Every structure is written in structure tokens, then in C-alpha cells.
CSV table of N, CA, C and O in Angstrom, one decimal:
chain,number,residue,atom,x,y,z
A,2,UNK,N,123.9,81.9,92.3
A,2,UNK,CA,122.7,82.5,92.8
A,2,UNK,C,122.7,84.0,92.8
A,2,UNK,O,122.9,84.7,93.7
A,3,UNK,N,122.4,84.6,91.6
A,3,UNK,CA,122.3,86.0,91.4
A,3,UNK,C,120.8,86.3,91.3
A,3,UNK,O,119.9,85.5,91.4
A,4,UNK,N,120.4,87.6,91.1
A,4,UNK,CA,119.1,88.0,91.3
A,4,UNK,C,118.1,87.6,90.2
A,4,UNK,O,117.1,87.1,90.5
A,5,UNK,N,118.5,87.8,89.0
A,5,UNK,CA,117.6,87.3,87.9
A,5,UNK,C,117.8,85.8,87.6
A,5,UNK,O,117.7,85.5,86.4
A,6,UNK,N,118.0,85.0,88.5
A,6,UNK,CA,118.2,83.5,88.3
A,6,UNK,C,117.7,82.7,89.4
A,6,UNK,O,117.9,81.5,89.4
A,7,UNK,N,116.9,83.2,90.3
A,7,UNK,CA,116.6,82.5,91.5
A,7,UNK,C,115.4,81.5,91.4
A,7,UNK,O,115.4,80.4,92.0
A,8,UNK,N,114.3,82.0,90.7
A,8,UNK,CA,113.1,81.3,90.7
A,8,UNK,C,112.3,81.6,89.4
A,8,UNK,O,112.9,82.2,88.5
A,9,UNK,N,111.0,81.3,89.3
A,9,UNK,CA,110.2,81.7,88.3
A,9,UNK,C,108.8,82.1,88.8
A,9,UNK,O,108.2,81.3,89.5
A,10,UNK,N,108.4,83.3,88.6
A,10,UNK,CA,107.2,83.8,89.2
A,10,UNK,C,106.3,84.6,88.1
A,10,UNK,O,106.8,85.2,87.2
A,11,UNK,N,105.0,84.4,88.3
A,11,UNK,CA,104.1,85.1,87.4
A,11,UNK,C,102.9,85.6,88.1
A,11,UNK,O,102.5,85.1,89.1
A,12,UNK,N,102.4,86.8,87.7
A,12,UNK,CA,101.1,87.4,88.0
A,12,UNK,C,101.1,88.1,89.4
A,12,UNK,O,100.1,88.1,90.1
A,13,UNK,N,102.2,88.7,89.9
A,13,UNK,CA,102.3,89.3,91.2
A,13,UNK,C,102.8,90.7,91.1
A,13,UNK,O,103.7,91.0,90.3
A,14,UNK,N,102.1,91.6,91.8
A,14,UNK,CA,102.3,93.1,91.7
A,14,UNK,C,102.7,93.6,93.1
A,14,UNK,O,102.2,93.2,94.1
A,15,UNK,N,103.7,94.6,93.1
A,15,UNK,CA,104.1,95.2,94.4
A,15,UNK,C,104.1,96.7,94.3
A,15,UNK,O,104.5,97.3,93.3
A,16,UNK,N,103.5,97.3,95.3
A,16,UNK,CA,103.4,98.8,95.4
A,16,UNK,C,104.2,99.3,96.6
A,16,UNK,O,104.0,98.8,97.7
A,17,UNK,N,105.2,100.2,96.4
A,17,UNK,CA,106.0,100.7,97.5
A,17,UNK,C,106.1,102.2,97.5
A,17,UNK,O,106.1,102.8,96.4
A,18,UNK,N,106.3,102.8,98.7
A,18,UNK,CA,106.3,104.3,98.9
A,18,UNK,C,107.8,104.7,99.3
A,18,UNK,O,108.5,103.9,99.8
A,19,UNK,N,108.1,106.0,99.0
A,19,UNK,CA,109.4,106.5,99.3
A,19,UNK,C,109.6,106.6,100.8
A,19,UNK,O,108.7,106.8,101.6
A,20,UNK,N,110.9,106.6,101.2
A,20,UNK,CA,111.2,106.8,102.7
A,20,UNK,C,110.9,108.3,103.1
A,20,UNK,O,110.8,108.5,104.3
A,21,UNK,N,110.8,109.2,102.2
A,21,UNK,CA,110.6,110.6,102.4
A,21,UNK,C,109.2,111.0,102.3
A,21,UNK,O,108.8,112.2,102.4
A,22,UNK,N,108.3,110.0,102.1
A,22,UNK,CA,106.9,110.3,102.1
A,22,UNK,C,106.2,109.6,103.3
A,22,UNK,O,105.0,109.5,103.3
A,23,UNK,N,107.0,109.2,104.3
A,23,UNK,CA,106.5,108.5,105.4
A,23,UNK,C,107.0,109.2,106.7
A,23,UNK,O,108.2,109.6,106.8
A,24,UNK,N,106.1,109.2,107.7
A,24,UNK,CA,106.5,109.6,109.0
A,24,UNK,C,107.2,108.4,109.7
A,24,UNK,O,107.1,107.3,109.3
A,25,UNK,N,108.0,108.8,110.7
A,25,UNK,CA,109.0,107.8,111.3
A,25,UNK,C,108.3,106.7,112.1
A,25,UNK,O,108.6,105.5,111.9
A,26,UNK,N,107.3,107.1,113.0
A,26,UNK,CA,106.7,106.1,113.8
A,26,UNK,C,105.2,106.2,113.6
A,26,UNK,O,104.5,107.1,114.1
A,27,UNK,N,104.6,105.3,112.8
A,27,UNK,CA,103.1,105.4,112.5
A,27,UNK,C,102.3,105.1,113.7
A,27,UNK,O,101.4,105.9,114.1
A,28,UNK,N,102.5,103.9,114.3
A,28,UNK,CA,101.7,103.4,115.5
A,28,UNK,C,102.7,102.8,116.4
A,28,UNK,O,103.2,101.7,116.2
A,29,UNK,N,103.0,103.5,117.5
A,29,UNK,CA,104.1,103.1,118.4
A,29,UNK,C,103.6,102.4,119.7
A,29,UNK,O,104.0,101.3,120.0
A,30,UNK,N,102.7,103.0,120.5
A,30,UNK,CA,102.2,102.4,121.7
A,30,UNK,C,100.7,102.1,121.7
A,30,UNK,O,100.2,101.6,122.7
A,31,UNK,N,100.0,102.6,120.7
A,31,UNK,CA,98.6,102.2,120.5
A,31,UNK,C,98.4,100.8,119.9
A,31,UNK,O,97.5,100.1,120.2
A,32,UNK,N,99.4,100.5,119.0
A,32,UNK,CA,99.5,99.2,118.4
A,32,UNK,C,100.7,98.3,118.9
A,32,UNK,O,100.6,97.1,118.8
A,33,UNK,N,101.6,98.9,119.6
A,33,UNK,CA,102.8,98.2,120.0
A,33,UNK,C,102.5,97.2,121.1
A,33,UNK,O,102.9,96.0,120.9
A,34,UNK,N,101.9,97.6,122.2
A,34,UNK,CA,101.6,96.7,123.3
A,34,UNK,C,100.5,95.7,123.0
A,34,UNK,O,100.5,94.6,123.6
A,35,UNK,N,99.5,95.9,122.1
A,35,UNK,CA,98.6,94.7,121.8
A,35,UNK,C,99.3,93.8,120.8
A,35,UNK,O,98.7,92.7,120.6
A,36,UNK,N,100.4,94.2,120.1
A,36,UNK,CA,101.1,93.2,119.3
A,36,UNK,C,102.1,92.4,120.1
A,36,UNK,O,102.2,91.2,119.8
A,37,UNK,N,102.7,92.9,121.1
A,37,UNK,CA,103.6,92.2,121.9
A,37,UNK,C,102.9,91.3,122.9
A,37,UNK,O,103.3,90.2,123.2
A,38,UNK,N,101.7,91.7,123.4
A,38,UNK,CA,100.9,90.9,124.2
A,38,UNK,C,100.3,89.7,123.4
A,38,UNK,O,99.9,88.7,124.0
A,39,UNK,N,100.3,89.8,122.1
A,39,UNK,CA,99.8,88.6,121.3
A,39,UNK,C,101.0,87.6,121.2
A,39,UNK,O,100.7,86.4,121.3
A,40,UNK,N,102.2,88.0,121.0
A,40,UNK,CA,103.3,87.1,120.9
A,40,UNK,C,103.8,86.6,122.2
A,40,UNK,O,104.5,85.6,122.3
A,41,UNK,N,103.4,87.2,123.4
A,41,UNK,CA,103.7,86.7,124.7
A,41,UNK,C,102.7,85.6,125.1
A,41,UNK,O,103.2,84.6,125.7
A,42,UNK,N,101.4,85.7,124.8
A,42,UNK,CA,100.5,84.7,125.1
A,42,UNK,C,100.7,83.4,124.3
A,42,UNK,O,100.2,82.4,124.7
A,43,UNK,N,101.3,83.5,123.2
A,43,UNK,CA,101.6,82.4,122.3
A,43,UNK,C,102.8,81.5,122.9
A,43,UNK,O,102.6,80.3,123.2
A,44,UNK,N,103.9,82.1,123.0
A,44,UNK,CA,105.2,81.4,123.4
A,44,UNK,C,105.6,81.7,124.8
A,44,UNK,O,106.7,82.3,125.0
A,45,UNK,N,104.7,81.4,125.8
A,45,UNK,CA,105.1,81.4,127.2
A,45,UNK,C,104.6,80.1,127.8
A,45,UNK,O,105.0,79.8,128.9
A,46,UNK,N,103.8,79.4,127.0
A,46,UNK,CA,103.3,78.1,127.4
A,46,UNK,C,104.3,77.0,127.0
A,46,UNK,O,104.2,75.9,127.5
A,47,UNK,N,105.2,77.3,126.1
A,47,UNK,CA,106.3,76.4,125.7
A,47,UNK,C,107.6,76.8,126.4
A,47,UNK,O,108.4,75.9,126.5
A,48,UNK,N,107.8,78.0,126.8
A,48,UNK,CA,109.1,78.4,127.3
A,48,UNK,C,109.2,78.3,128.8
A,48,UNK,O,110.2,77.8,129.3
A,49,UNK,N,108.2,78.9,129.5
A,49,UNK,CA,108.3,79.1,130.9
A,49,UNK,C,108.2,77.8,131.8
A,49,UNK,O,109.0,77.7,132.7
A,50,UNK,N,107.3,76.9,131.6
A,50,UNK,CA,107.2,75.7,132.5
A,50,UNK,C,108.4,74.8,132.6
A,50,UNK,O,108.5,74.1,133.6
A,51,UNK,N,109.3,74.7,131.6
A,51,UNK,CA,110.6,74.1,131.8
A,51,UNK,C,111.4,74.8,132.9
A,51,UNK,O,112.2,74.1,133.5
A,52,UNK,N,111.3,76.1,133.1
A,52,UNK,CA,112.1,76.8,134.0
A,52,UNK,C,111.6,77.0,135.4
A,52,UNK,O,112.2,77.5,136.2
A,53,UNK,N,110.3,76.5,135.6
A,53,UNK,CA,109.8,76.5,137.0
A,53,UNK,C,110.1,75.1,137.6
A,53,UNK,O,110.0,74.9,138.8
A,54,UNK,N,110.5,74.1,136.7
A,54,UNK,CA,111.0,72.8,137.1
A,54,UNK,C,112.4,72.9,137.6
A,54,UNK,O,112.8,72.2,138.6
A,55,UNK,N,113.2,73.8,137.1
A,55,UNK,CA,114.5,74.1,137.6
A,55,UNK,C,114.4,74.8,139.0
A,55,UNK,O,115.2,74.6,139.9
A,56,UNK,N,113.4,75.6,139.1
A,56,UNK,CA,113.2,76.4,140.4
A,56,UNK,C,112.8,75.5,141.5
A,56,UNK,O,113.4,75.7,142.6
A,57,UNK,N,111.9,74.6,141.4
A,57,UNK,CA,111.5,73.8,142.5
A,57,UNK,C,112.5,72.7,142.9
A,57,UNK,O,112.5,72.2,144.0
A,58,UNK,N,113.5,72.5,142.0
A,58,UNK,CA,114.6,71.6,142.4
A,58,UNK,C,115.7,72.5,143.1
A,58,UNK,O,116.3,72.0,144.0
A,59,UNK,N,115.9,73.7,142.7
A,59,UNK,CA,116.8,74.6,143.4
A,59,UNK,C,116.4,75.0,144.8
A,59,UNK,O,117.2,75.0,145.7
A,60,UNK,N,115.1,75.2,145.0
A,60,UNK,CA,114.6,75.6,146.3
A,60,UNK,C,114.6,74.3,147.2
A,60,UNK,O,114.7,74.5,148.5
A,61,UNK,N,114.4,73.2,146.7
A,61,UNK,CA,114.5,71.9,147.5
A,61,UNK,C,115.9,71.5,147.6
A,61,UNK,O,116.3,70.8,148.6
A,62,UNK,N,116.8,71.9,146.7
A,62,UNK,CA,118.2,71.4,146.7
A,62,UNK,C,119.1,72.2,147.7
A,62,UNK,O,120.2,71.8,147.9
A,63,UNK,N,118.6,73.3,148.1
A,63,UNK,CA,119.3,74.1,149.2
A,63,UNK,C,118.6,74.1,150.5
A,63,UNK,O,119.0,74.7,151.5
A,64,UNK,N,117.5,73.3,150.6
A,64,UNK,CA,116.8,73.1,151.8
A,64,UNK,C,117.1,71.7,152.4
A,64,UNK,O,116.7,71.3,153.5
A,65,UNK,N,117.9,70.9,151.6
A,65,UNK,CA,118.4,69.6,152.1
A,65,UNK,C,119.9,69.7,152.4
A,65,UNK,O,120.3,69.1,153.4
A,66,UNK,N,120.6,70.6,151.8
A,66,UNK,CA,122.0,70.9,152.1
A,66,UNK,C,122.2,71.7,153.4
A,66,UNK,O,123.2,71.5,154.1
A,67,UNK,N,121.2,72.5,153.8
A,67,UNK,CA,121.2,73.2,155.0
A,67,UNK,C,120.7,72.4,156.2
A,67,UNK,O,121.0,72.8,157.4
A,68,UNK,N,119.9,71.4,156.0
A,68,UNK,CA,119.6,70.4,157.0
A,68,UNK,C,120.5,69.3,157.1
A,68,UNK,O,120.4,68.4,158.0
A,69,UNK,N,121.5,69.2,156.2
A,69,UNK,CA,122.6,68.2,156.2
A,69,UNK,C,123.7,68.6,157.1
A,69,UNK,O,124.7,67.8,157.2
A,70,UNK,N,123.6,69.8,157.7
A,70,UNK,CA,124.7,70.3,158.5
A,70,UNK,C,124.3,70.6,159.9
A,70,UNK,O,125.1,71.2,160.7
A,71,UNK,N,123.0,70.3,160.3
A,71,UNK,CA,122.5,70.7,161.6
A,71,UNK,C,121.6,69.5,162.2
A,71,UNK,O,121.7,68.4,161.7
A,72,UNK,N,120.8,69.8,163.1
A,72,UNK,CA,119.8,68.9,163.6
A,72,UNK,C,118.4,69.5,163.7
A,72,UNK,O,117.9,70.0,162.7
B,200,UNK,N,94.0,125.2,58.5
B,200,UNK,CA,95.2,125.5,57.8
B,200,UNK,C,95.1,125.1,56.3
B,200,UNK,O,94.2,124.4,55.9
B,201,UNK,N,96.0,125.6,55.5
B,201,UNK,CA,96.0,125.4,54.1
B,201,UNK,C,95.4,126.6,53.3
B,201,UNK,O,95.6,127.7,53.7
B,202,UNK,N,94.8,126.3,52.2
B,202,UNK,CA,94.2,127.4,51.4
B,202,UNK,C,92.8,127.7,52.0
B,202,UNK,O,91.8,127.1,51.7
B,203,UNK,N,92.8,128.8,52.8
B,203,UNK,CA,91.6,129.2,53.5
B,203,UNK,C,91.6,130.7,53.7
B,203,UNK,O,92.7,131.3,53.8
B,204,UNK,N,90.4,131.3,53.7
B,204,UNK,CA,90.3,132.7,54.1
B,204,UNK,C,89.8,132.8,55.5
B,204,UNK,O,88.9,132.0,55.9
B,205,UNK,N,90.4,133.7,56.3
B,205,UNK,CA,89.9,133.9,57.7
B,205,UNK,C,88.6,134.6,57.6
B,205,UNK,O,87.7,134.3,58.5
B,206,UNK,N,88.3,135.4,56.7
B,206,UNK,CA,87.0,136.1,56.6
B,206,UNK,C,85.9,135.1,56.3
B,206,UNK,O,84.9,135.1,57.0
B,207,UNK,N,86.2,134.2,55.3
B,207,UNK,CA,85.2,133.2,54.9
B,207,UNK,C,84.9,132.3,56.1
B,207,UNK,O,83.7,131.9,56.3
B,208,UNK,N,85.9,131.9,56.8
B,208,UNK,CA,85.8,131.0,58.0
B,208,UNK,C,85.0,131.7,59.1
B,208,UNK,O,84.3,131.0,59.9
B,209,UNK,N,84.9,133.0,59.2
B,209,UNK,CA,84.2,133.7,60.2
B,209,UNK,C,82.7,133.7,60.0
B,209,UNK,O,82.0,133.4,60.9
B,210,UNK,N,82.3,133.9,58.7
B,210,UNK,CA,80.8,133.8,58.4
B,210,UNK,C,80.3,132.4,58.5
B,210,UNK,O,79.2,132.2,58.9
B,211,UNK,N,81.1,131.4,58.1
B,211,UNK,CA,80.8,130.0,58.3
B,211,UNK,C,80.7,129.7,59.8
B,211,UNK,O,79.8,128.9,60.2
B,212,UNK,N,81.5,130.3,60.6
B,212,UNK,CA,81.4,130.2,62.0
B,212,UNK,C,80.2,131.0,62.5
B,212,UNK,O,79.6,130.6,63.5
B,213,UNK,N,79.8,132.1,61.9
B,213,UNK,CA,78.7,132.8,62.3
B,213,UNK,C,77.4,132.1,62.0
B,213,UNK,O,76.5,132.1,62.9
B,214,UNK,N,77.2,131.5,60.8
B,214,UNK,CA,76.0,130.9,60.5
B,214,UNK,C,75.8,129.5,61.1
B,214,UNK,O,74.6,129.1,61.4
B,215,UNK,N,76.9,128.8,61.5
B,215,UNK,CA,76.8,127.5,62.0
B,215,UNK,C,77.0,127.5,63.5
B,215,UNK,O,76.3,126.7,64.2
B,216,UNK,N,77.9,128.3,64.1
B,216,UNK,CA,78.2,128.2,65.5
B,216,UNK,C,77.6,129.4,66.3
B,216,UNK,O,78.3,130.0,67.1
B,217,UNK,N,76.4,129.7,66.0
B,217,UNK,CA,75.7,130.8,66.7
B,217,UNK,C,74.7,130.4,67.8
B,217,UNK,O,74.5,131.1,68.7
B,218,UNK,N,74.2,129.1,67.7
B,218,UNK,CA,73.3,128.6,68.7
B,218,UNK,C,73.9,128.1,69.9
B,218,UNK,O,73.3,127.6,70.8
B,219,UNK,N,75.3,128.1,70.0
B,219,UNK,CA,76.0,127.8,71.2
B,219,UNK,C,75.8,128.9,72.3
B,219,UNK,O,76.1,130.1,72.0
B,220,UNK,N,75.4,128.5,73.5
B,220,UNK,CA,75.2,129.5,74.5
B,220,UNK,C,76.5,130.0,75.0
B,220,UNK,O,77.5,129.3,75.1
B,221,UNK,N,76.6,131.3,75.3
B,221,UNK,CA,77.9,132.0,75.7
B,221,UNK,C,78.3,131.8,77.1
B,221,UNK,O,79.5,131.7,77.4
B,222,UNK,N,77.4,131.9,78.0
B,222,UNK,CA,77.7,131.7,79.5
B,222,UNK,C,77.4,130.2,79.8
B,222,UNK,O,77.0,129.4,78.9
B,223,UNK,N,77.4,129.9,81.1
B,223,UNK,CA,77.2,128.5,81.6
B,223,UNK,C,75.8,128.4,82.2
B,223,UNK,O,75.1,129.3,82.4
B,224,UNK,N,75.4,127.1,82.4
B,224,UNK,CA,74.2,126.8,83.2
B,224,UNK,C,74.5,127.0,84.6
B,224,UNK,O,75.4,126.3,85.2
B,225,UNK,N,73.7,127.9,85.3
B,225,UNK,CA,73.8,128.4,86.7
B,225,UNK,C,75.1,129.2,86.9
B,225,UNK,O,75.2,129.8,88.0
B,226,UNK,N,76.0,129.2,86.0
B,226,UNK,CA,77.3,130.1,86.1
B,226,UNK,C,78.2,129.6,87.3
B,226,UNK,O,78.9,130.5,87.8
B,227,UNK,N,78.2,128.3,87.6
B,227,UNK,CA,79.1,127.8,88.6
B,227,UNK,C,80.4,127.5,87.9
B,227,UNK,O,80.6,126.3,87.4
B,228,UNK,N,81.3,128.4,87.8
B,228,UNK,CA,82.5,128.4,87.0
B,228,UNK,C,83.4,127.3,87.6
B,228,UNK,O,83.5,127.1,88.8
B,229,UNK,N,84.2,126.6,86.8
B,229,UNK,CA,85.1,125.6,87.3
B,229,UNK,C,86.4,126.1,87.8
B,229,UNK,O,86.8,127.2,87.4
B,230,UNK,N,87.0,125.4,88.8
B,230,UNK,CA,88.3,125.8,89.3
B,230,UNK,C,89.1,124.5,89.3
B,230,UNK,O,88.7,123.4,89.5
B,231,UNK,N,90.4,124.8,89.0
B,231,UNK,CA,91.4,123.7,88.9
B,231,UNK,C,91.6,123.0,90.2
B,231,UNK,O,92.0,123.7,91.2
B,232,UNK,N,91.5,121.7,90.3
B,232,UNK,CA,91.9,120.9,91.5
B,232,UNK,C,93.2,120.4,91.1
B,232,UNK,O,93.2,119.4,90.3
B,233,UNK,N,94.4,120.9,91.6
B,233,UNK,CA,95.7,120.6,91.1
B,233,UNK,C,96.1,119.2,91.5
B,233,UNK,O,95.5,118.5,92.3
B,234,UNK,N,97.3,118.8,91.1
B,234,UNK,CA,97.8,117.4,91.2
B,234,UNK,C,99.2,117.5,91.7
B,234,UNK,O,100.0,118.2,91.1
B,235,UNK,N,99.6,116.7,92.7
B,235,UNK,CA,100.9,116.7,93.3
B,235,UNK,C,101.7,115.4,92.9
B,235,UNK,O,101.0,114.3,92.7
B,236,UNK,N,103.0,115.5,92.9
B,236,UNK,CA,103.9,114.4,92.5
B,236,UNK,C,104.3,113.6,93.8
B,236,UNK,O,104.2,114.1,94.9
B,237,UNK,N,104.6,112.3,93.6
B,237,UNK,CA,104.9,111.4,94.7
B,237,UNK,C,106.0,110.4,94.2
B,237,UNK,O,105.7,109.6,93.3
B,238,UNK,N,107.1,110.4,94.9
B,238,UNK,CA,108.1,109.3,94.7
B,238,UNK,C,107.6,108.0,95.3
B,238,UNK,O,107.3,107.9,96.5
B,239,UNK,N,107.5,106.9,94.4
B,239,UNK,CA,107.0,105.6,94.7
B,239,UNK,C,107.3,104.7,93.6
B,239,UNK,O,108.0,105.0,92.7
B,240,UNK,N,106.7,103.5,93.6
B,240,UNK,CA,107.1,102.4,92.7
B,240,UNK,C,106.0,101.4,92.5
B,240,UNK,O,105.2,101.2,93.4
B,241,UNK,N,105.9,100.8,91.3
B,241,UNK,CA,105.0,99.7,91.0
B,241,UNK,C,105.8,98.7,90.1
B,241,UNK,O,106.4,99.1,89.1
B,242,UNK,N,105.8,97.4,90.5
B,242,UNK,CA,106.5,96.3,89.9
B,242,UNK,C,105.5,95.2,89.4
B,242,UNK,O,104.7,94.8,90.3
B,243,UNK,N,105.5,94.8,88.2
B,243,UNK,CA,104.7,93.7,87.7
B,243,UNK,C,105.6,92.6,87.1
B,243,UNK,O,106.2,92.8,86.1
B,244,UNK,N,105.7,91.5,87.8
B,244,UNK,CA,106.6,90.4,87.6
B,244,UNK,C,106.0,89.3,86.8
B,244,UNK,O,105.0,88.7,87.2
B,245,UNK,N,106.5,89.1,85.6
B,245,UNK,CA,105.9,88.1,84.7
B,245,UNK,C,107.0,87.5,83.8
B,245,UNK,O,107.4,88.1,82.9
B,246,UNK,N,107.5,86.3,84.2
B,246,UNK,CA,108.7,85.7,83.6
B,246,UNK,C,108.4,85.1,82.3
B,246,UNK,O,109.4,84.8,81.6
B,247,UNK,N,107.1,84.9,81.9
B,247,UNK,CA,106.8,84.3,80.6
B,247,UNK,C,106.9,85.3,79.4
B,247,UNK,O,106.9,84.9,78.3
B,248,UNK,N,107.0,86.6,79.7
B,248,UNK,CA,107.2,87.6,78.7
B,248,UNK,C,108.7,87.6,78.3
B,248,UNK,O,109.5,87.5,79.2
């Protein structure tokens, strides 16, 4: 797998600019937080509700162990 | 260039190239809008050539 042996492609053009013709940070916090808020609204409905099921077992699991030693 | 007289070429220029106006229309003379260089790249990929 070397570079001129990977695939076969036709009719595609690429334009690129030098690293010395570009400023370092084009859009940092005017575009940064509406892009992160898009990726947070997507994958927090798959990640977070499994971890609140651990929480309700933890808070119930140390409210039975502390009534297991008293009256 | 070649076998030519400069004198003869001048009168031929005088009788034929005289109706050309010498100044411009409204005299809004042109100015050079210069051109700058830019490091960059363009790639056209075509494996059938």
C-alpha cells in the first residue's frame, strides 16, 4: 500500500493555500461555541441517561446500608 | 526588417497612419492595477490519462 497504488479516481480537483497566507485563528469563539453546542445536543441523548441510572442506584444503595445499622 | 528604407516607411506611415487621433477620448489615462504572487496549489486527478 504505497501512494500511487491505493485506488482509482477520475474528475476531482483540489485547491489549497499556503500556511503563510493564512491567519492562525479565523473564527474562534463566534463559530466555536455554536459548533460545540451542535455536537452536544446530538450525543447527550445516547451518553447521559445510562449514567443517571447508576446515580439512582448509588443514592438508594447507601440509603439502605445506613438504615441497615440503626432503627 | 529586411530590405527597407526608414525614409520610405515614414511617408507610407504619414499617408496611411494620419487619421489616428493622438490623444484619448475624454483623456482618462490608464493606470496599472498590479498583480501579486501567492503560494498555493491546484491538483487535477485523472487516472485514465
